Amino acid sequence: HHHHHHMVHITLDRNTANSWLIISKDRRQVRMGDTHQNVSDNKERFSNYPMVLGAQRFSSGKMYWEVDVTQKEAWDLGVCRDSVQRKGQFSLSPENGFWTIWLWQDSYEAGTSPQTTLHIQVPPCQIGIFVDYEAGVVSFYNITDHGSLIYTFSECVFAGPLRPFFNVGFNYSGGNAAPLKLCPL
Ligand SMILES: C[C@H](NC(=O)C1CC1)c1cccnc1
């Protein structure tokens, strides 16, 4: 692809993090802690899942960023409305304000309702995410495979400001402790 010139410097917003996450000092890496991380509760925190938002809000333009997923067995990535539900159980869908892909149990899916099987021959170690606000597009690219297209959500109805969205996943297996990292420009 040719989206690299729309690169934006994303940072994680600690206040939105599930209370078990550890965000690095530079706000560019997030991972699940061993226990709870000794923060007060607030209405912004995701309660049920190991999720966090980027600090940046987008309401126009074209934006691009990259995320490192090396070693991980499970994660969700994409964008979401600033006003998505934080508490309780919910599915990742455009109806609920999410435009996401994921890895789970050795398969890659897009967060449509119902979910859509992705066809990935080269397991990605870094994912590129492109948003065109005006066009209503969110696209995902396999950086490990020369930028090949993974998935395009088109005809998106954002209906609000967008924030970068992350889920590091649970670590019941002991094989999913590695971080999500925002990769340098
Ligand atoms: C407490 C624990 N935390 C981790 O494993 C962190 C090191 C990644 C845990 C337990 C069960 C499911 N997910 C996570």
From Swiss-Prot:
Post-translational events: Autoubiquitinated; does not lead to its proteasomal degradation. Deubiquitinated by USP4; leading to its stabilization. Autoubiquitinated.
GO cellular component terms attached to this protein's record: autophagosome; cytoplasm; cytoplasmic stress granule; cytoplasmic vesicle; nucleus; P-body; ribonucleoprotein complex
GO molecular function, one term: DNA binding
Limits of the B30.2/SPRY domain: 8-185
Keyword rRNA processing attributed: no
Inducers of expression: Up-regulated by IFN.
Subcellular location(s) of the protein: Cytoplasm; Cytoplasmic vesicle, Autophagosome; Nucleus; Cytoplasm, P-body
Major place of residence: cytoplasm
Keywords from the named record: Cell cycle, Coiled coil, Cytoplasm, Cytoplasmic vesicle, DNA-binding, Metal-binding, Nucleus, Ribonucleoprotein, RNA-binding, Transferase, Ubl conjugation, Ubl conjugation pathway, Zinc, Zinc-finger
GO BP terms: negative regulation of innate immune response; negative regulation of NF-kappaB transcription factor activity; negative regulation of protein deubiquitination; positive regulation of autophagy; positive regulation of cell cycle; positive regulation of protein binding; protein autoubiquitination; protein destabilization
Known partners and oligomeric status: Homotrimer. Component of a SCF(SKP2)-like complex containing CUL1, SKP1, TRIM21 and SKP2. Interacts with CALR, CUL1, FBXW11, HSPA5, IKBKB, IRF3, SKP1 and VCP. Interacts with SKP2; the interaction with SKP2 does not depend on an intact F-box domain. Interacts (via N-terminus and C-terminus) with DCP2 (via N-terminus and C-terminus). Interacts (via C-terminus) with IRF8 (via C-terminus). Interacts with ULK1, BECN1 and with ATG8 family members, including GABARAP, GABARAPL1, GABARAPL2 and MAP1LC3C/LC3C. Interacts with TRIM21 and SQSTM1/sequestosome 1. Interacts with IRF3.
Membership in a protein family: Belongs to the TRIM/RBCC family.
Function text: E3 ubiquitin-protein ligase whose activity is dependent on E2 enzymes, UBE2D1, UBE2D2, UBE2E1 and UBE2E2. Forms a ubiquitin ligase complex in cooperation with the E2 UBE2D2 that is used not only for the ubiquitination of USP4 and IKBKB but also for its self-ubiquitination. Component of cullin-RING-based SCF (SKP1-CUL1-F-box protein) E3 ubiquitin-protein ligase complexes such as SCF(SKP2)-like complexes. A TRIM21-containing SCF(SKP2)-like complex is shown to mediate ubiquitination of CDKN1B ('Thr-187' phosphorylated-form), thereby promoting its degradation by the proteasome.
Comment text on domains: The coiled-coil is necessary for the cytoplasmic localization. The RING-type zinc finger is necessary for ubiquitination and for the IRF3-driven interferon beta promoter activity. Interacts with SKP2 and CUL1 in a RING finger-independent manner. The RING-type zinc finger is necessary for ubiquitination of NMI.
Protein name: E3 ubiquitin-protein ligase TRIM21
Native source organism of the sequence: Mus musculus (Mouse)
